[PDB]
């Protein structure tokens, strides 16, 4: 009976909540109450990457920490040499509604997707000296909101059809599909070991998936509205979410519950992007009020502001050695901060 | 810098030039978002994404029909939103009004003007002439409504006034709605879109030039 199934589901929810409550002894703030304050964090715009003629939806850093790819709604992917601000590549797109982009760890490929429901893989290393689309991954029934390369032949995409998928670019087939979200999945983040990933959807919950197996391991709730950003802690045992209730939250996989809340009274706009520092001590979040805030992740005290964008900050990344922060925005400008 | 860095910078400058020409070519087109509904006949207005292109008076228009709180944010830089309403069916009129209110009051669509096409006026005229269906049942205020065939005229004016009240209840002039009456056989909808977009761009220029 439907009523009996609902009763069993709510009983299990109560049991899980009680287990989480029992497992909680002291909040993260109490533990990190004696930690020395991080102090004011001042970053100045080292580089301003100009050339996009429309709002920027996504950016991704290369593993070399020097090359980055940016996606813009004018149907162009631009690969920047951030040291010299030289445009290495400019990739025309079949659809100009791109809302995500990725850079392969090897650096041979970039990916993008959007309202066309397709992830396109582009080969940067061709014998013809030209960038060409390698594979087009079709099968998602909603807009692609994120994509992350696992290796040169495996990619994970989160779509607007409330599903996340793992692809095999060699054959262009969905190897496994991750289901369970009841809202549009907006972003995903891969663990350092690339065995698990976390995805945040429009149902105000994040889920931890097993790439090899293909089912959700844990579900994390606590946000009051749609989750727009997510990113792993550098050690892979935690992650931070950025949502539309003007709040960032930190979750621990082992504790399977919330850890700390990153909110302020005069912040009412939603968070569009979230990223950690190299050591995980600083959390950087992009907001709709045109600014980026730096949060002391251990103490939930704001450490700085990356003011300098005149529109919504849509993307935000940190290099693999932590030497810079690149924030793109809806004013068609990218900035490198240090 | 070195010789290779000089050549790399020259290639970057060539890329910059090509991007500038592409943007100059793409800035002369006007992008529109078609946001009707099923039974509204929005497809038969101008003679994944159902993109349709038309040109009047040597001005190019690009219309995007996606086939919602998240993907609607991509269309915040469009020239205007073309909202098509089936005015003959009173049952779905309130749903159309709610949809129009949601689009109008959105945070990222708060500066976009809406070209409202009240489609299928001929069917509405036939329905009001028949008298079988009364607008007063669905909309009580139509019973005590008098216009500023007279019955068809007051029905049309009440239907348009509902949407106009929704549009003027907020905005403070940052964007306005351009109501129109369409019979799904009228061939002047492209001209109406062009004139309304020209007025929208004129008002935008007046705003950005510190003249308004």
């Amino acid at each position, epitope marked *: 009976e439907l009523d009996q199934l609902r009763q069993e589901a709510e009983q299990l929810k109560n049991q899980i909540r009680d287990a989480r409550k029992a497992c909680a002894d002291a909040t993260l703030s109490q533990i990190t109450n004696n930690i020395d304050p991080v102090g004011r964090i001042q970053m100045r715009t080292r580089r301003t990457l100009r050339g996009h003629l429309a709002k920027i939806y996504a950016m991704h850093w290369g593993t070399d920490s*020097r*090359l980055l790819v940016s996606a813009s709604q004018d149907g162009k992917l631009i690969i920047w*040499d951030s040291y*010299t601000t*030289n445009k*290495v*590549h400019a990739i025309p797109l079949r659809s100009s509604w791109v809302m995500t982009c990725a850079y392969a760890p090897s650096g041979n490929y970039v990916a993008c997707g959007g309202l066309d429901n397709i992830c396109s893989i582009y080969n940067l*290393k061709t*014998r*013809e*000296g*030209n960038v060409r689309v390698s594979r087009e991954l079709a099968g998602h029934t909603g807009y692609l909101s994120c994509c992350r390369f696992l290796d040169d032949n495996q990619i994970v995409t989160s779509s607007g059809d409330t599903t996340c998928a793992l692809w095999d670019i060699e054959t262009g087939q969905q190897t496994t599909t991750f289901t369970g979200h009841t809202g549009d999945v907006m972003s995903l983040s891969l663990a350092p070991d690339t065995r698990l990933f976390v995805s945040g959807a429009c149902d105000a919950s994040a889920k931890l998936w097993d790439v090899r197996e293909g089912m959700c391991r844990q579900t994390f709730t606590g946000h009051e509205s749609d989750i727009n950003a997510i990113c792993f802690f550098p050690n892979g045992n935690a992650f931070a979410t950025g949502s539309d209730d003007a709040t960032c939250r930190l979750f621990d996989l082992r504790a399977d519950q919330e850890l700390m809340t990153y909110s302020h009274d005069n912040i009412i706009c939603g968070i569009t992007s979230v990223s950690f520092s190299k050591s995980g001590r600083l959390l950087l979040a992009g907001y709709d009020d045109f600014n980026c805030n730096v949060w002391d992740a251990l103490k939930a005290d704001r450490a700085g502001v990356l003011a300098g964008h005149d529109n919504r900050v849509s993307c935000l990344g940190v290099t693999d050695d932590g030497m810079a922060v690149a924030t793109g925005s809806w004013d068609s400008f990218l900035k490198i901060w240090n | *810098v*070195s*010789a*290779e*860095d*000089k*050549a*790399a910078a*020259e*290639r*970057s400058k*060539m890329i910059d030039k090509n991007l500038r020409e592409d943007g100059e070519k793409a800035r002369r087109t006007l992008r529109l978002l078609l946001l009707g509904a099923d039974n509204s006949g929005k497809s038969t207005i101008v003679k994944g994404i159902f993109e349709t292109k038309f040109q009047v008076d040597k001005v190019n228009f690009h219309m995007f029909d996606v086939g919602r709180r998240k993907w609607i944010q991509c269309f915040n830089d469009v020239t205007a939103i073309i909202f098509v309403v089936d005015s003959s069916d009173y049952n779905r009129l309130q749903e159309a009004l709610n949809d129009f209110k949601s689009i109008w009051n959105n945070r990222w669509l708060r500066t976009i003007s809406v070209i409202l096409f009240l489609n299928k006026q001929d069917l509405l005229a036939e329905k009001v002439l028949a008298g079988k269906s009364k607008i007063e049942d669905y909309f009580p205020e139509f019973a005590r409504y008098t216009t500023p065939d007279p019955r068809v005229t007051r029905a049309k004016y009440f239907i348009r006034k509902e949407f106009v009240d929704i549009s003027t209840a907020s905005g403070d002039g940052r964007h306005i709605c351009y109501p129109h009456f369409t019979c799904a056989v009228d061939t002047e909808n492209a001209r109406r879109i062009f004139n309304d977009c020209k007025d929208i761009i004129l008002q935008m220029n007046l705003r950005e030039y510190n003249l308004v």
Partner: single-chain antibody
Amino acid sequence: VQLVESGGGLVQPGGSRKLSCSASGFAFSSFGMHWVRQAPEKGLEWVAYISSGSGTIYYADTVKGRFTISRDDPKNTLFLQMTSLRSEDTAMYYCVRSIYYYGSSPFDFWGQGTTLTVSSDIVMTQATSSVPVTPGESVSISCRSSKSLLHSNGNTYLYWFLQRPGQSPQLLIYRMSNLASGVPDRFSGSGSGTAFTLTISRLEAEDVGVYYCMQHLEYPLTFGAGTKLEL
């Protein structure tokens, strides 16, 4: 990729001859194109260079004012106009493609070469010229430069080419340590700023030939004399 050059042959001294090269199989408009000579029984010698889009043009000091380099991007053709040819321009002329961006591999592909017969800058001293060797024995090819090839940005602009007997040169190592695509992992490059060594861990029958060193620090590009490995 394919570069084919035509226009060589016997030329009377003081005359004029035009060399044309047709590029097929790659985006010819995105590559800067060079010309390289090789006089018989002598090493290579860079001649000219035209940038992508013909923006930047350079000539060797021994050809400047007489040779003219041009490209036809729609026709994917590269030309070299030679006027007042004298009795030392007799050589085999190679067309070379080279694209410059961060991480690129210039001088990757070399044309077949056409033969023409008639009648201050960094010097790269390659010292040894012939070294006998047996297959399976590791070889080190040394190099020297008058001026340090290491730049302030951290790139040591030294290029290693191999010219097999009766074949065009092939890029083995770019910017000192980078190993070109399609090259076996046996080859390796090392050297800090002026003394460079080319290492071949295992020698096969296909590694015989003359190995050349090139500097790309400054636009008067110069080559070494070449080391010949024979069995």
